[PDB]
Amino acid sequence: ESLRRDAALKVNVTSAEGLQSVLETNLGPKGTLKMLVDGAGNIKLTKDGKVLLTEMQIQSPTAVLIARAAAAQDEITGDGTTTVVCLVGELLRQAHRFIQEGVHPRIITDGFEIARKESMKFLDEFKISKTNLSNDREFLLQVARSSLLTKVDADLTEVLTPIVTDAVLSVYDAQADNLDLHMVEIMQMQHLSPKDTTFIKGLVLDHGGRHPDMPTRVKNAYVLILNVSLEYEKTLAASERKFVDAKLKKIIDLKNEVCGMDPDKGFVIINQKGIDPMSLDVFAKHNILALRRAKRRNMERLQLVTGGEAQNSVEDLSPQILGFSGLVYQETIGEEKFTYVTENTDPKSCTILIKGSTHYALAQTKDAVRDGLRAVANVLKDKNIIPGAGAFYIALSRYLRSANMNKLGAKGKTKTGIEAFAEALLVIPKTLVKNSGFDPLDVLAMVEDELDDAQDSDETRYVGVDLNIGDSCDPTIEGIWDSYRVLRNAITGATGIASNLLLCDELLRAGRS
């Protein structure tokens, strides 16, 4: 009978092309947002790649591999993950143009690996060198603005642009040392609107004393780290009060050693367990702030923030234990009080105070800040900054069409594979124009007209894409820029994901349950 075997056609494509049109709408700054609702009513609204795949449930088994392959995209980049998906979707339709004519799927895979080596040759000349040791905020505000406009609106962009710039600059130094593991400090709370968010240069504590006379706004204070607590317990009762009253005078004597009588020198204590409100009257007469119910993670961070030392027993007291703070403010919201400690001499970490009301409003700005801070973090690590606004994708397609048999010297079999890759390069700037309302083909046609004049101009220039006006522009004037490591793994990861889906000509179902 023979025959049988199998045919490679759109049946295998329907699984991998389903996410194309789904992820095409949210691509770019003009894109939309996807929501995730549970049975309890909680709604998380964001377009970030975390919910697009891992938190998305679909009967298509291809999305499982797309979600697993996105683990490297979220860690290294995390922004614009839908661009790689649109690259694969265009190459799937190119199979019916090529593979359907009798071309073997292995033939077009050579064009992807050759393009990867040729992309690095073009990426080296296309990148622009910049000195990050000069602490220039010109490009830092542009890259941050380009990341915010692609996530939040223009109102949240103006506020968060200087905040994110100065957040990473605090840890950044002449040695280019930026550690995001030790500095996280994400405050999740509902207050005012997300446009009211503020920046803090130090750790914020989520606990506070309920005593009414506790000073809120204090010029400065000396943080005394204590892992124990001195209060009245059930315990005979005078035996435990003797150890508390004796160590209480040592706390007062510690304030006298630093000369606490000076209004320019304050004093503050913190304890892990609760504090007897009867003992708070002593701290109120001396204008001493008290803190109870402190977390173990927060107390360990105060040693590296305030600059003091962590002490267990109250019997041991030294001036080196007390820290320093330039500003101390305590705000009462709800049943908890938040103490703002900032303006330290040498802060080792900072935080961005989050505001909002609804659950989706906080989650929208929760990932946007961490992804926006990671985008500008690679700018300090990358000595070369890549022009954005589709300048890399459009100019790369022209480089492949110019040199084909002169440099690579294709025999004609791989010529279709190297050409199909250039067809998908214009899809990413094509989706940007479609979301802006302008015609995708007419706008890209005017951009290519300037590219032809740039080759005959005998000068170094880069042609950008402006979505508002719809004509060519300068990526330097526009401000859209990309880090070197962002497009390094993006082009490399795009060749691996697209090749793995094209090599599967047959699907079966079997295994162990």
Binding site: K30, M35, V37, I43, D153, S357, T358, Y360, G437
Partner: protein, 71 residues
């Protein structure tokens, strides 16, 4: 809307939006639901005309700053 059980997750945006008004003020809740509900009703004509949400969102944000100047 607090006591009511709504099975449509899309319209729940206006339900949770009341919390922003209750915390800031607590009054004019009926005025917000009528205003916010009408802005999405009059925008249905612009959607049928083929106008993208880019100028629609920018149009409301541009007129919002003009209203604060008149107040």
């Amino acid at each position: 809307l607090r006591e009511l059980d709504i099975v449509h997750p899309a319209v729940k945006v206006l339900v949770m939006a009341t919390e922003q008004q209750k915390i800031d003020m607590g009054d004019g809740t009926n005025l917000v639901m009528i205003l916010a509900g009408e802005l999405l009703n009059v925008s249905e004509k612009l959607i049928s005309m083929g106008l993208s949400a880019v100028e629609i969102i920018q149009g409301y944000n541009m007129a919002r700053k003009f209203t604060l100047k008149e107040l």
